[PDB]
Amino acid sequence: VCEKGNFNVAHGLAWSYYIGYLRLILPELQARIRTYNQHYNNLLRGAVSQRLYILLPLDCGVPDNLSMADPNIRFLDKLPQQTGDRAGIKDRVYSNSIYELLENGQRAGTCVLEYATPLQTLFAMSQYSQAGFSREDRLEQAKLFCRTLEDILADAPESQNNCRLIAYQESSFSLSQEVLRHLRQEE
Amino acid sequence: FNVAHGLAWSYYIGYLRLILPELQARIRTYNQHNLLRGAVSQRLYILLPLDCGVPDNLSMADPNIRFLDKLPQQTGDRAGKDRVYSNSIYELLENGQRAGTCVLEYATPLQTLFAMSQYSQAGFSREDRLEQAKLFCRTLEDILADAPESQNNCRLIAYQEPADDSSFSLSQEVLRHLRQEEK
Numbered sequence A: 001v002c003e004k005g006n007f008n009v010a011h012g013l014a015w016s017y018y019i020g021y022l023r024l025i026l027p028e029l030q031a032r033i034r035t036y037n038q039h040y041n042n043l044l045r046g047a048v049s050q051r052l053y054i055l056l057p058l059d060c061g062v063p064d065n066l067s068m069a070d071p072n073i074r075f076l077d078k079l080p081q082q083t084g085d086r087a088g089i090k091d092r093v094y095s096n097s098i099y100e101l102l103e104n105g106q107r108a109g110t111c112v113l114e115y116a117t118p119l120q121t122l123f124a125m126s127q128y129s130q131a132g133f134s135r136e137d138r139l140e141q142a143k144l145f146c147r148t149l150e151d152i153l154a155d156a157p158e159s160q161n162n163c164r165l166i167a168y169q170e171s172s173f174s175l176s177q178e179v180l181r182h183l184r185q186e187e
Numbered sequence B: 001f002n003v004a005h006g007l008a009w010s011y012y013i014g015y016l017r018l019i020l021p022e023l024q025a026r027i028r029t030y031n032q033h034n035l036l037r038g039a040v041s042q043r044l045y046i047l048l049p050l051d052c053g054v055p056d057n058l059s060m061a062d063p064n065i066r067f068l069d070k071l072p073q074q075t076g077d078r079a080g081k082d083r084v085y086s087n088s089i090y091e092l093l094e095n096g097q098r099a100g101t102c103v104l105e106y107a108t109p110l111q112t113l114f115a116m117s118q119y120s121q122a123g124f125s126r127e128d129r130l131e132q133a134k135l136f137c138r139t140l141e142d143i144l145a146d147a148p149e150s151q152n153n154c155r156l157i158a159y160q161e162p163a164d165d166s167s168f169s170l171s172q173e174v175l176r177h178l179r180q181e182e183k
């Protein structure tokens, strides 16, 4: 019933997110985006941004369909896939989805956008009795996850201007506006 | 309580509860586009090496475990489109000849506990790793015992291989479970 427990849970999930995904995809991400831009997206104001944008809703409410969370977020395409032999599974697949961000009926941005999948584990553990966690535990673990992940990425050699965390609290809220603000701060 | 609790819950929530309900069907679609060769056990076999030593290719754990084929892929839109869930069908050799076939893999979260033991910023000792590996196994087993998505469709094999022990055949151990099952 302590924070040390809320800390250990988030610490492990943040490391898992780095070890099993970010350290493996971030190094070839900008090649994949550059490839996409050069070959399949010659739109001079429509280029896919060079960073993976990771949505960290602090209530850990993660829809599976991002486009449905905002009429102004439209699925556009997938990057070229990346495969790996992982833990005795041949060709485990790593894929990333490109979204268009609309504003005043116009395209305002294009980016690789996704929620941090591990927040779904923090939500489930808040909902399942066997896991033994309260909403207040979930909110603490979500904050500790984002902080651990930032500290990890700040020192990680695979993170070099290719990743951006978007943490926010969540009706009146536009997720596209939340991402557009971060995107527009890049260039 | 600790790191393993989140890892065990993550493995159930993000993988087992999603793939196990559909596993039985995928194995039939495989057997309909393979009976003359030998049927694949209808259960996902998950290896839990407690030393957290998890080669990405199983033949390097034991050369008698050979990749035969990949089961039909399962794709799911997850956390924002067509995330692919893939599984690998292996043959187990006895005296250079196929003794069995199953869907077989390591529990990937054990590689996290290993890499955490290796990164200074994780503050994770090798004693922490063994302790957390056992907690992972027990937490996962406790979850799967009450999980509705596990209806005789999964088998966990937890084991401690001591250092440099030629007395251990992973192939034989899996075959022992496969032979016990058919009985």
Ligand SMILES: Nc1nc(=O)c2ncn([C@@H]3O[C@@H]4COP(=O)(O)O[C@H]5[C@@H](O)[C@H](n6cc(-c7ccc(-c8ccc9ccccc9c8)cc7)c7c(N)ncnc76)O[C@@H]5COP(=O)(O)O[C@@H]3[C@@H]4O)c2[nH]1
Binding pocket: A016, A017, A018, A019, A020, A021, A089, A092, A093, A094, A095, A096, A097, A114, A115, A117, A118, A121, B010, B011, B012, B013, B014, B015, B016, B078, B079, B080, B081, B082, B083, B084, B085, B086, B107, B108, B109, B112
């Ligand atoms: N965004 C993202 N894409 C990835 O491809 C990926 N891969 C690992 N991770 C995270 O990195 C951390 C450590 O990973 P790990 O392998 O160590 O532990 C895993 C693993 O044992 C098992 N498991 C999970 C997956 C899996 C498949 C697809 C997605 C996904 C999610 C959002 C997307 C958004 C857009 C496009 C594509 C998207 C794809 C996520 C997980 C998986 C698989 N395909 N085959 C075999 N076993 C599997 O369940 C454990 C917990 O899974 P969790 O879902 O919580 O997400 C894990 C985890 O938190 C990923 N995140």
